[PDB]
Amino acid sequence: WEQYRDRVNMLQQERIRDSPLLQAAKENDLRLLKILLLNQSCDFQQRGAVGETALHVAALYDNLEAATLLMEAAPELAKEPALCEPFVGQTALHIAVMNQNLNLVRALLARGASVSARATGAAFRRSPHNLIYYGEHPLSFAACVGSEEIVRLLIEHGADIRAQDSLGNTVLHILILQPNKTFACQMYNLLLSYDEHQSLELVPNHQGLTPFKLAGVEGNTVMFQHLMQKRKHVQWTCGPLTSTLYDLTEIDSWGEELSFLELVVSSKKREARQILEQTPVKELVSFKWKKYGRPYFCVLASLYILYMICFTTCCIYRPLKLRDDNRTDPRDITILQQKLLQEAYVTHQDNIRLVGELVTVTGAVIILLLEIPDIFRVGASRYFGQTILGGPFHVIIITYASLVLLTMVMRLTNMNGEVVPLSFALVLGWCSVMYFARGFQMLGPFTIMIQKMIFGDLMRFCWLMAVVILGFASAFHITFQTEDPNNLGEFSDYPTALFSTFELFLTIIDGPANYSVDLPFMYCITYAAFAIIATLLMLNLFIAMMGDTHWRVAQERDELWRAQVVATTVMLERKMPRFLWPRSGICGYEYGLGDRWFLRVENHHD
Amino acid sequence: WEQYRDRVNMLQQERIRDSPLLQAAKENDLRLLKILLLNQSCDFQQRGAVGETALHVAALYDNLEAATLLMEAAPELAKEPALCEPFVGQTALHIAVMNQNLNLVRALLARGASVSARATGAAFRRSPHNLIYYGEHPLSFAACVGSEEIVRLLIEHGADIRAQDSLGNTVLHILILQPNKTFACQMYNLLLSYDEHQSLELVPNHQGLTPFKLAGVEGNTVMFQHLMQKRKHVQWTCGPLTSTLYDLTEIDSWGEELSFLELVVSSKKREARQILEQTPVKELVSFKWKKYGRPYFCVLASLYILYMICFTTCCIYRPLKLRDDNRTDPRDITILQQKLLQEAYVTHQDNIRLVGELVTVTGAVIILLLEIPDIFRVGASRYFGQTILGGPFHVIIITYASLVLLTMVMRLTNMNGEVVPLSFALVLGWCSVMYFARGFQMLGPFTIMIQKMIFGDLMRFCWLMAVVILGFASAFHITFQTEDPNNLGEFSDYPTALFSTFELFLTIIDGPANYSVDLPFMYCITYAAFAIIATLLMLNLFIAMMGDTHWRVAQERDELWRAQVVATTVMLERKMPRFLWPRSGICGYEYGLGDRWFLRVENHHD
């Protein structure tokens, strides 16, 4: 992209330098402008590399005199935009409003330039290539640069408020998408003042988001607290304490297929979860979590724990018979094998294991029925990537259910090797019990912190560890390759030496030392080297690195846990039936407020 | 609670909106007030949902003109309060004084509203549900809002000083219970100036607390140093150093059944221990600890240590005989059994063990005689919950004494299994030696720090640990369920596999590796997974988590240790006899100061 944009800018400057009218409109050299604009033979419709006119060049460098003599020479240049690929619909109005000068915009609207021109180029799209996103209209441009007089001039010269760009964003959507939020709050106030002449606060874009929902997703909290000034009503104020009444129509979103809180918690932005700490939202999600979220989550946690005890008990009592084949061979310790299906269920305890395994299989089926439409409904990268929603826990529960169904397939068809999917299934299901740790303050941030160092320091330590494992595994294997394996069998072969020095990295098993024989002298030297640079240096520096990372990431995980119980509450509200979750808030139709639901907040000041 | 309070507020606003007189008194629409108050047919005694009148609505929204025309129409509305459940006795005076306007309070006292009205509703009680606690009287309301002219106006219109609410709190009690302490000290000075016309600084509430004792329990130190301005006398000032004389009548509390320092150290508030760092109290408790508390605590510590040596020596030399039953069975290593009671005491060394066990039993009896009335005197949740008083040490002392008495029961009646209560008794008694570590600066904060890590990170690590223990215990048990237990017996059965992977989590015993046999290939994979995510990840992140928590909690344990020796001193002063602890301070009757005891403090300034 960047080479193409650089070539576009250098070609634009080259055709500015080549054309003398464009070059003099750039430098505001007035006498040569009077000579060339006096000449009839000079073509005034000549274009640059992107197709910009001389009026575009005069508006680009804030040359008011050059521009006003160009429209005295040719007013029709106020109508023509650029016509190439990066600036598909950029007029002189866009550059004049962006450059923020009143006289050029006044003269351009005096000559009759079209206000509803859409700058549909690739440089005006909401792209991470582009530095800014100001929209496609001069109305959105005047809102984004923050000029009050230019946007009032555009309103009195036209500029219909309900104008949407290629993404369907209105002017309030783009104003929410800007930085410097307090400087855009008065712009939102002025455009809401001009909106009164259906409402534009309730119309969506092509993504389906209202400006309230876009303020929730983008996470700009100053704009959210400005938008809830119109959705609240102070009931009374007594002494230091007031009671006010927030509206839950735009926040709870009962009848909508996509709710506000779901779009806040399933958002890619870092600052979206701060919307959950705002004064109409935090008490609502705390009420929802304390009344219905926490007991239903504890019931589901205890049910999954009892299901894990059932699955573990069925794995312990698995059908095994004696080995029919004669061993007649050293190093072999297996004495039992898997029973066939015709002999697996012959007794009463086998029938108890049968109904327990049926409970296990039916449980894995209802897990897949709960989780597969959640995979298909929202984006799968967002479903497995957000730690607020519980992505790694989701993929290990999918893997556990797939391994249980693979076990059911290999139990129906008698093939050996069932112990390996029972092993990953037991490990993954019990590690997936930890999804329910987010409902507790004692267990929640610790579980977030251990997943953040699953994806953090442990991967770089496994790379820089397996480097040392390969090198010292090769050295330990070759220094005992000429020796007897019956006297020191830690490094007899190369996978054994690899696993052995993996255990000796972590100081799990002892260093191999047979004091009744003479070990090679090279083994002591390379083991002194391995003991210094790996067990003493690298392991304890891994401890120091997670100790350094803990206090840096502690604020993030503490502010992400209280964003995690909100996503748990939103999941539990839509997955569970409607009769177990009554509608939150206060019914206004009981008190004559007109079929709207409200949240009453009593707070203390002074 | 909160749904009921929200329903009360919405019903109150609904009956405000339904009644036109209440609605116009809310909005201060004066012309419709003149029309309706001109009409004789309009009922002026009509009430809201909580029973408030129109004068209450006019005082709620600071409508002075609406209120004064309502009492020109009906002065008798100044007398009626609300009469429902949340506002049982709220008058218009309470709302007018809370709203802080002089003219409405002046006009309400002109119409004859009763000053001694008690607002005995549930919204005025000292509850965690209520945001404020301002009392029940307009005198206490005027003191709590901090308006001087309103409370002087109430004094000239009545407002007796010795008025107590439903908790027995006077106006000085509620003023101590407020925040913004320096703003309430001037109100305390004003009410103490009006108190001179028995004293209210000496009267208790229903809990039995003076305002001095309530300032100690609540822990507000600015009010404490303001209250000790009247209880101190500067003797002289020479150069940069002054000698002053504090009064120890309200602080030491010799004749009282409940002392001041005991109520400070056995307080649920976090800020109570800062009262122990104040300038009359800190030198007093330092003199009490240095002169009497530390030698008596060291004598008690040495006596308890010698009693542990006696109990340990009696546990080592316990009567054991040879096993009469023939073994005839592998895996059995027991060769000795418990002697019967008729053969336990036949020799001289058995008599030495007998008198040592009598010392042990008599010691456990006198421990129970010291400790059981301490549980029965103060609250048992406060006795076992405060780490300043030593709650966990108290409950393991009760458990140790109960296990010694259970041992005495099983020694008198010859039943096998005495080694298990000797095991918990030895562990709990030696861990209850650590109660005496609080008397030393080197050992005290470390013992508080290990106590807060018992009740902090170890419980969450045990939950997130036992999850991994259950999963990898199940996996390790099933991957060796088909193998010979004689070659690798770490995971032969499921409690053995559970204990084995518990030791493998903490890297205590080595990883099970028999190099003379071929282990299953799945064991190496799941042991590599267990070695990465548990021994490398979770254990060292537990180290990092207590390393992060240590510098956060270090200030708390350092300021809680010097609150712990004060509670030790208060316990040692009342448990021990009176002749070993003489009365602290300086006897004024020797110097003619009139049967009061004083503490002289010489300090340096400039």
UniProtKB/Swiss-Prot annotation, chains A, B:
Cytoplasmic side: 1-295, 377-387, 438-460
TM ranges: 296-316, 354-376, 388-410, 417-437, 461-481, 525-545
Main location: membrane
Gene Ontology MF terms: calcium channel activity; calmodulin binding; identical protein binding; metal ion binding
Chain segments carrying region Interaction with S100A10: 566-570
Intramembrane: 492-512
The keyword Lipid metabolism appears for this protein: no
Annotated control of activity: Activated by WNK3.
UniProt-reported outcome of changing D510A: Abolishes Ca(2+) permeation and Ca(2+)-dependent current decay; no effect on monovalent cations permeation
Residue intervals annotated with topology Extracellular: 317-353, 411-416
Positions annotated to bind Ca(2+): D510
ANK repeats mapped onto the chain: 16-46, 50-79, 88-117, 134-163, 167-197, 207-236
UniProt effect for mutating D510 to E/N/M: Attenuates Ca(2+) permeation and Ca(2+)-dependent current decay
Tissue: Detected in kidney cortex, in distal convoluted tubules and cortical collecting ducts (at protein level). Detected in duodenum, jejunum, ileum, kidney and placenta.
Function field: Constitutively active calcium selective cation channel thought to be involved in Ca(2+) reabsorption in kidney and intestine. Required for normal Ca(2+) reabsorption in the kidney distal convoluted tubules. The channel is activated by low internal calcium level and the current exhibits an inward rectification. A Ca(2+)-dependent feedback regulation includes fast channel inactivation and slow current decay. Heteromeric assembly with TRPV6 seems to modify channel properties. TRPV5-TRPV6 heteromultimeric concatemers exhibit voltage-dependent gating.
Quaternary context: Homotetramer. Probably forms heterotetramers with TRPV6. Interacts with TRPV6. Interacts with S100A10 and probably with the ANAX2-S100A10 heterotetramer. The interaction with S100A10 is required for the trafficking to the plasma membrane. Interacts with calmodulin. Interacts with BSPRY, which results in its inactivation.
Similarity remark: Belongs to the transient receptor (TC 1.A.4) family. TrpV subfamily. TRPV5 sub-subfamily.
Protein name, entry field: Transient receptor potential cation channel subfamily V member 5
Shown residues within the full chain: 29 to 638 of 730
